[PDB]
Amino acid sequence: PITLYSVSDGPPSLAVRQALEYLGLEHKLVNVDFGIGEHMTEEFAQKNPQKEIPVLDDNGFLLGESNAILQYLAERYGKDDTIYPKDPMARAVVNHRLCFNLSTYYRYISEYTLAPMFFDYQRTPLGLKKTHIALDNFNTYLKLLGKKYAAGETVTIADFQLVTATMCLEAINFDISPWPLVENWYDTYKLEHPTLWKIVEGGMKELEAFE
Amino acid sequence: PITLYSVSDGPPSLAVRQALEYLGLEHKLVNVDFGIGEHMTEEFAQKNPQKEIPVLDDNGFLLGESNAILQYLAERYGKDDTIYPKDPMARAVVNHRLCFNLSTYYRYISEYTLAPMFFDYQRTPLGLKKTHIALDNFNTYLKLLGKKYAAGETVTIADFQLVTATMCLEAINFDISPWPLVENWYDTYKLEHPTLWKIVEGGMKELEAFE
Ligand SMILES: N[C@@H](CCC(=O)N[C@@H](CS)C(=O)NCC(=O)O)C(=O)O
Ligand SMILES: N[C@@H](CCC(=O)N[C@@H](CS)C(=O)NCC(=O)O)C(=O)O
């Protein structure tokens, strides 16, 4: 079987869960922030030095880092390659956007939105400026590629990540209308993939309560 | 033709250059920190909103993010898949280590070593602790996988990145002997891939001068 160790309102976990839903993959979900889930990772803590969540357990194969989990699930499962194309150039655009999310978009958004929620970290003007730069960059990338989704004309695993990062801004009532291509993309995602957005919305609601 | 826009002593650039050498790919190298290189990216600055370096220009296809550049070069070129295996599980270990480098290993090392060199950023005990955690994690990953290299028994594109991150510690005379598996891996890399280490060493020497 497949088991996902996850944080119920963690954007990386929510990215992986959208992929599992899109691919129709049965799995056990362990929310490590829910009740006894805290201890349900003890069976493999020496194996994740980073205290790594999410972690995917595919029939004994343990894999961390949400980007790598998504790249693995999409290559190994599914009837076609549309969410992670095999063509090297098409794939490179997906891989680029996944790197952009990890290094820049979700890096700066998460530091401004979530870190102050759950830590003694402070929101600052500099953190706000970096959030604006990340949104500028994403708006420009959408304009440059010229397609409906972040790495193609249809959804890919890059969108699964970028959506959960953008949701962090919504969770704190951050107005994204200054980035019209990002706003249009986000609304289009929700309209065309309601069962995927539904997963992310459940996490958003938890975050709004503890904003 | 292929053109690489690079920073002569930038670890991400040096990772890509090792791949170009390993794959035997002829290319034009533009060091944007050398003389007139500063302006030689003006022909595509609207196209890289992040002020993105390195950037690969493969016959008109422009690709940023060093991880994505490496994943593209290794899939598109080369006679075998040993530096980026096609098998989904073997590939997932490479992808995981690339994510680990971006999110954690090079993230914390670069903030402790290089950012204070070239900015008003300060070395702190917390930054040192995070460097130690990153090295702990890498030592544990090498032990867990149990292989000679970071994602297999032979070199992969993950090693090209992890080597340039570790070089930043060497550039400031940081002793890595408390992490014996990392030290052994680093020395083995240099012994078995001298033409690749040579590229990285040239950048190290520039960084040592301005440490
Ligand atoms: N780079 C990792 C980040 C995962 C992550 O940050 N997980 C959080 C929960 S949202 C955690 O539990 N620990 C890491 C932290 O301190 O942020 C990924 O994409 O999977
Ligand atoms: N995530 C990017 C990082 C590239 C990067 O940081 N490049 C540096 C030179 S080493 C730069 O020129 N600008 C970004 C910065 O401010 O660090 C990658 O892996 O390619």
Author numbering:
A (entry chain A), B (entry chain A): 2 to 212
Sentences from the paper on this structure:
Glutathione S-transferases (GSTs) constitute a large superfamily of multifunctional enzymes that are ubiquitously present in both prokaryotes and eukaryotes. In general, GSTs catalyze the conjugation of the reduced glutathione (GSH)—a nucleophilic tripeptide comprised of three amino acids: cysteine, glutamic acid, and glycine—to a wide range of substrates that have an electrophilic carbon, nitrogen, or sulfur atom. In the current study, we identified an unclassified GST gene, LdGSTu1 from the Colorado potato beetle (CPB, Leptinotarsa decemlineata [Say]) in Coleoptera, which represents the most species-rich eukaryotic order, containing about half of the described herbivorous insect species (>400,000). The enzyme kinetic parameters and enzyme-substrate interaction studies demonstrated that LdGSTu1 could catalyze the conjugation of GSH to both CDNB and PNA, with a higher turnover number for CDNB than PNA.
Here, we solved the LdGSTu1 co-crystal structure with its nucleophilic substrate GSH by using X-ray diffraction. The LdGSTu1 structure was refined to a resolution of 1.80 Å. Two monomers of LdGSTu1 were in the crystal asymmetric unit. Chain A complexed with GSH has an open active site similar to previously published GST structures, whereas the chain B monomer vacant of GSH has a more closed active site, suggesting flexibility in loop-helix-loop region in the active site of the N-term domain of GSTs. The dimer is a result of crystal packing and not expected to be a biologically relevant dimer assembly as the active sites are solvent exposed and not internal to the dimer interface as reported for biological dimer assemblies in previous GST crystal structure studies. LdGSTu1 consists of two domains, the N-term domain and the C-term domain connected by a linker region coil. A molecular lipophilicity potential surface reveals that the LdGSTu1 substrate binding pocket has a more hydrophilic region on the N-term domain side of the binding pocket, which is bound with GSH and makes up the “G-site”, and a more lipophilic region in the substrate binding pocket adjacent to the bound GSH on the C-term domain side of the pocket making up the “H-site”. The GSH is bound to LdGSTu1 via an extensive hydrogen bonding network that includes amino acid side chains, backbone carbonyls, backbone amides and crystallographic water. The presumptive catalytic Ser14 formed a hydrogen bond with the thiol group of GSH bridged via a water molecule. The “H-site” of LdGSTu1 is largely hydrophobic and consists of Tyr107, Ser111, Leu115, Ala116, Phe119, Phe120, Leu208, Ala210, and Phe211.
